[PDB]
Amino acid sequence: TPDVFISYRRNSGSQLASLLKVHLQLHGFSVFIDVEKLEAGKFEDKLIQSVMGARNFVLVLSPGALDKCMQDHDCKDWVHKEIVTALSCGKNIVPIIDGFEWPEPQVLPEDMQAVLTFNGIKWSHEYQEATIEKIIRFLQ
Ligand SMILES: Nc1cccc2cc[n+]([C@@H]3O[C@H](COP(=O)(O)OP(=O)(O)OC[C@H]4O[C@@H](n5cnc6c(N)ncnc65)[C@H](O)[C@@H]4O)[C@@H](O)[C@H]3O)cc12
């Protein structure tokens, strides 16, 4: 099963999520991203189980990526669901920051505020190899 789960906002982080997948696979990691590895069945259960299966949770924070999480107290938003699963399973969470502005904790539902306490990696378009090398250091 995959070592790394990539969580991303489809309308803004899909290209970076795909780029991360390629690089991490070239360095020998088994990676889950939905468009490559989510197969048949009820997607809610399969996606949550895939987060649970992976030791590492790579979170692509593109601009506004947590906006649809705000006030989503019923946890219907999928990035919210994936984050809460990763937090509650104690995953190695690795945020990747690409134009993202850190929100104040109290705008987010309580069950995901802890995502802001993890050390994040700044994506550098000018120094991508170095960014990737730092991500690999963060992976377990
Ligand atoms: N693979 C997945 C399948 C289904 C739903 C998913 C929702 C979320 N995700 C996870 O959550 C993050 C994205 O959140 P998001 O809020 O960016 O996503 P969207 O709500 O835009 O949906 C994403 C796309 O699935 C289309 N869609 C809607 N109903 C569908 C259906 N019955 N069968 C197929 N496709 C459907 C929807 O039309 C769009 O093309 C990622 O990390 C990812 O792992 C992955 C999904």
Contacts of 80 (CB under 8 A, 6+ apart): 68, 69, 72, 109, 112
For β-strands 56-61 and 4-7, DSSP reports them as: parallel
83 and 59 Cβ atoms separated by less than 8 Å? yes
The side-by-side arrangement of strands in the sheet containing 56-61 is 31-32, 4-7, 56-61, 92-97, 121-122
- Sign of the Cα pseudo-torsion (88, 5, 136, 118, in order): negative
Atom of ligand 1 lying closest to residue 9 CA: 17
Name the residue among 10, 4, 3 with its Cα closest to residue 79: 10
Could you tell me the residue range of the domain that residue 73 belongs to? 1-140
Query: d(Cα 46, Cα 107) in Å, to the nearest integer?
Result: 29
39 is in an annotated binding site: yes
User: Structure resolution in Å?
Assistant: 1.7
Query: d(Cα 33, Cα 56) in Å, to the nearest integer?
Result: 12
Tell me which residues have their CB closer than 6 angstroms to ligand 1. 7-11, 34, 38, 43, 47, 78-79, 82
Q: Cα dist. 40→24, 45, 52, 85 in Å? A: 25, 11, 18, 21
Query: d(Cα 34, Cα 5) in Å, to the nearest integer?
Result: 9
19 and 58 Cβ atoms separated by less than 8 Å? no
Query: d(Cα 5, Cα 31) in Å, to the nearest integer?
Result: 6
Contacts of 58 (CB under 8 A, 6+ apart): 4, 5, 6, 7, 20, 24, 94, 96, 135
Around Cβ 81, how many Cβ atoms within 10 Å? 19
Query: d(Cα 85, Cα 27) in Å, to the nearest integer?
Result: 26
Query: d(Cα 124, Cα 128) in Å, to the nearest integer?
Result: 6
Annotated active-site residue 82? The verdict is yes
Residue with the smallest CA separation from ligand 1 atom 1 is 34
Query: d(Cα 20, Cα 31) in Å, to the nearest integer?
Result: 9
| Cα 130 to ligand 1 centre (Å) | 31
Exposed / middle / buried, residue 9 (Cβ in 10 Å: 0-12, 13-18, 19+): buried
24 and 135 Cβ atoms separated by less than 8 Å? yes
Number of structural domains found in the chain: 1
Measured in degrees and rounded to the nearest 5, phi and psi for residue 41 equal: 125, -170
Q: Where are the alpha helices (DSSP H) in 1-140?
A: 14-26, 34-37, 43-53, 78-88, 128-138
